[PDB]
């Protein structure tokens, strides 16, 4: 029993490490087509793809696991991966100071017969709530789904859905909601508009927060970047990476790995210092269909997709669309961030 716990712990460490690397690979892909602000949830994406794997089988499923950097996760047991997210969800749900909740919906077309084993496993691992839905009534379907997601994101993602493919048989939606409070809040009195350099030539004036206190930081001589920890309550933290130099310099995304991140954490020093950190609000959405194919996840989006763990009869289903939308607000009290990820399954 003690050995099962140690082993499940090693497996969870591996899942986390690989999900971080998946995240960095995906950021890199997103940054090929987007030159501005970016934000998304690596955790949410892996959780969403793992949800889909319950419906998939054979090479369709295995290619998803490779794409998630989860090839040869230390065990080869049935349900191992979703059981890891379940175990991870139950522990993260217990730390009340963390402020992290998650959940899952399955919106199912009213005439589409689904395998009960699918419902059983989804409920077991992701506590998925099943909501029958008429997808041939576009505006009704849009409103109902949006209400559900609006409620569970506490209004931070009011309209995840716009267009409704009338051939949709199932939409899986995962959400993650994080409300973190800073361990050392910024006092709003000291927040003033200051200069932020957009590039070597242009500046703009932005609300800039002041923090004073013990903070962990380090300077990476090689990238010429400062790396700073901004901890929250309940053992979460934001890592901020700031390049000193703007110009022809290195795309950090090309070198971001867990090895590098661990090098920075290994070399952190704590000291009294002042931090000036801007307020910000992002709201980014990405169709992931094509990026994921760029990471080798392909069969699930093709007419070869095997999603016969899903249909009571007949798999001629595929995933037409995977969309994530993420909002984040940073201010003197903390950070609130919400991610909603949808996968649409069509005949």
């Amino acid at each position: 029993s003690e050995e099962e716990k140690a082993w499940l712990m090693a497996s969870r460490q591996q899942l986390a490490k690989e999900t971080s690397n998946f995240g960095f690979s995906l950021l890199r892909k997103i940054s090929m087509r987007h030159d501005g602000n970016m934000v998304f949830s690596p955790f949410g994406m892996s959780l969403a793809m793992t949800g889909l794997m319950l419906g998939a089988t054979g090479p369709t499923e295995t290619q998803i696991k490779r794409g998630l950097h989860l090839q040869a996760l230390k065990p080869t047991k049935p349900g191992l991966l979703p059981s890891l997210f379940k175990g991870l969800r139950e522990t993260l749900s217990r730390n009340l100071e963390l402020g992290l909740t998650q959940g899952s919906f399955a919106f199912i077309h009213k005439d589409f017969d689904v395998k009960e084993t699918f419902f059983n496993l989804s409920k077991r691992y992701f506590d998925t709530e099943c909501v029958p839905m008429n997808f041939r009534n576009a505006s009704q379907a849009k409103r109902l789904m949006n209400h559900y997601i609006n409620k569970e994101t506490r209004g931070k993602i009011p309209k995840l859905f716009d267009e409704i493919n009338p051939e949709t048989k199932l939409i899986l939606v995962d959400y993650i909601l994080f409300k973190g409070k800073w361990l050392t809040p910024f006092d709003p009195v000291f927040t003033e508009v200051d200069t932020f350099h957009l590039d070597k030539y242009k500046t703009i004036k932005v609300p800039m927060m002041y923090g004073a206190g013990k903070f962990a930081s380090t300077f990476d001589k090689n990238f010429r970047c400062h790396v700073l920890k901004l901890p929250y309550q309940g053992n979460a933290t934001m890592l901020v990476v700031l390049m000193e130099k703007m110009g022809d310099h290195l795309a950090l995304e090309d070198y971001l790995t867990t090895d590098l991140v661990e090098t920075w954490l290994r070399n952190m020093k704590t000291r009294n210092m002042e931090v000036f950190f801007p307020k910000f609000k992002l709201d980014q959405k990405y169709e992931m269909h094509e990026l994921l194919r760029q990471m080798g996840i392909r069969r699930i989006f093709s007419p070869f997709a095997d999603l016969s763990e899903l249909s009571a009869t007949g798999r001629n289903l595929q995933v037409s669309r995977v969309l994530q939308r993420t909002v984040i607000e940073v201010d003197e009290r903390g950070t609130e961030a919400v991610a909603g990820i949808l996968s649409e399954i069509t005949a």
């Binding site: 950021l27 934000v39 973190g180 801007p278 709201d283």
Partner: protein
């Protein structure tokens, strides 16, 4: 007292420290828009 001045584009990661799970990952090149 040392200063870190985040007055230019940056990356950010939000991690849960026990699991090491990366919850949110991004880049801010301009903090006045979405």
């Amino acid at each position: 007292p040392p200063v870190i001045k985040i007055d230019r584009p940056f990356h950010f990661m939000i991690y849960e420290e026990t699991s090491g799970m990366l919850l949110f990952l991004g880049r801010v090149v301009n903090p006045t828009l979405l």
